[PDB]
Design a protein around this ligand. Structure first.
Ligand SMILES: Nc1ncnc2c1ncn2[C@@H]1O[C@H](COP(=O)(O)OP(=O)(O)OP(=O)(O)O)[C@@H](O)[C@H]1O
Ligand SMILES: [K+]
Ligand SMILES: [Mg+2]
Ligand code: NA
Length: 393
């Protein structure tokens, strides 16, 4: 009964959408925001916080504020990704008795789906508050590269949240369904360039209209699972650490609190530089010793940021070339390019993509919302708010 909600369960941010007839709507959460940080905190007084309230208390509760769980879900403890993360994450990653990668909080061992379920519960409650009725059914997205274990673990997170998971849909296909509502009629071949907080994906997708059905077919996919916005942040963090050392002679990498503050400040400055030519990073009392307190104040220009991440943006191009080769297409066979993911808002990324294809990406696809909207469209196809759509093998 009710609506089948569409959920984008992201590395960095999650969001929820519904179909109101032919019109998708992305829903704002209890904090008023159309996206929710994928952050789950277990507080000293026993509450579970999700989203911005969790983000806001991370500095004072670092061992019990969980994030980036999408990097662990469905994985084995000795997976190379997991082993890297054990060393860098401030929370405790452990081996379950069966060999899976788990987390431990205040002595309680938890599987990754038990943590991502808290985000899904917030998406469910958001939709219930908006609609005035219970929500029990959902479509949840996953990256195209996810394996069976990762897909099943995501389905399990939905069940833990009290949702019947009607379908798992791949993120590029969801973006294509969002585009396909307001697209030109007939045959179209699109390139979906998705640069999120954790991973990069390029998919070539063909849309057709035949025998009264709109068909969608993935012609090729490629990507880099170690290329995401968090890597852009890391380059800026490293610059700030190096500049502070050069100027003040102190290495902040030894101080976890300082490094947590730098991570937040670096991400804020990076986002600011998508619309400004320069910005300033100010962190009072970033460290202190017997000589006195030290305050960081560093100007970062857009040119400097571009130089720090140029090679990351360039790493996204070779997969583009291979995906076209695999699809048997040249760049002149692509009708539209769709940017998906918050990190595509960087002007340098937009310019490099346009230069590669020789045409500007579509402006009427919101890179932050397309995946959630596509999940909602799939939910409409299952009910009947949306008719005549077929996903081809
Ligand atoms: N205006 C902006 N300019 C540059 N980067 C941005 C901007 N807005 C958001 N970002 C970055 O986008 C990333 C988040 O993108 P998004 O929400 O698409 O990821 P996600 O869907 O959670 O990740 P994934 O698809 O990898 O699971 C973060 O690294 C964030 O700092
Ligand atoms: K997202
Ligand atoms: Mg995403
Ligand atoms: Na992505």
């Amino acid at each position: 009964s009710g609506k089948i909600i569409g959920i984008d369960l992201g590395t960095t941010n999650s969001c929820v959408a519904i179909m109101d007839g032919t019109t998708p709507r992305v829903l704002e959460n209890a904090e008023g925001d159309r996206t929710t940080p994928s952050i789950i905190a277990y507080t000293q007084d026993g509450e579970t916080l999700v989203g911005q309230p969790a983000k806001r208390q991370a500095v004072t509760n670092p061992q019990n504020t969980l994030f980036a769980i999408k990097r662990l879900i469905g994985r084995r403890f000795q997976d190379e990704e997991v082993q890297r993360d054990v060393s860098i994450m401030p929370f405790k990653i452990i081996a379950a008795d069966n060999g899976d990668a788990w987390v431990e909080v205040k002595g309680q061992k938890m599987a990754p789906p038990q943590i991502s379920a808290e985000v899904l519960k917030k998406m469910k409650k958001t939709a219930e508050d908006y609609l005035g009725e219970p929500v029990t059914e959902a479509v949840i997205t996953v990256p195209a590269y996810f394996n069976d274990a990762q897909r099943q673990a995501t389905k399990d997170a939905g069940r833990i949240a009290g949702l019947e998971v009607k379908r798992i849909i791949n993120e590029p296909t969801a973006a294509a369904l969002a585009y396909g509502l307001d697209k030109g009629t007939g045959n179209r071949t699109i390139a979906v360039y998705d640069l999120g907080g954790g991973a990069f994906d390029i998919s070539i997708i063909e849309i057709d209209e035949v025998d009264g059905e709109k068909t969608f077919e993935v012609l090729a996919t490629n990507g880099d699972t170690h290329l995401g916005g968090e890597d852009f942040d890391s380059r800026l963090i490293n610059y700030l650490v190096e500049e502070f050392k050069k100027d003040q002679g102190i290495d902040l990498r030894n101080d976890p609190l300082a490094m947590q503050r730098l991570k937040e400040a670096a991400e804020k400055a990076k986002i600011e530089l998508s619309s400004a030519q320069q910005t300033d990073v100010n962190l009072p009392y970033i460290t202190a010793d017997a000589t006195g307190p030290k305050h960081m104040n560093i100007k970062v220009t857009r040119a400097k940021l571009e130089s720090l991440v140029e090679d990351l943006v360039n790493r996204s191009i070779e997969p583009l070339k291979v995906a076209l080769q695999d699809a048997g297409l040249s760049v002149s066979d692509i009708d539209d390019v769709i940017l998906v993911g918050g990190q595509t808002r960087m002007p340098m990324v937009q310019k490099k993509v346009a230069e590669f294809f020789g045409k500007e990406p579509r402006k009427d696809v919101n890179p932050d919302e397309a995946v959630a909207i596509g999940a909602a469209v799939q939910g409409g196809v299952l009910t009947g708010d949306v008719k005549d759509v077929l996903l081809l093998d």
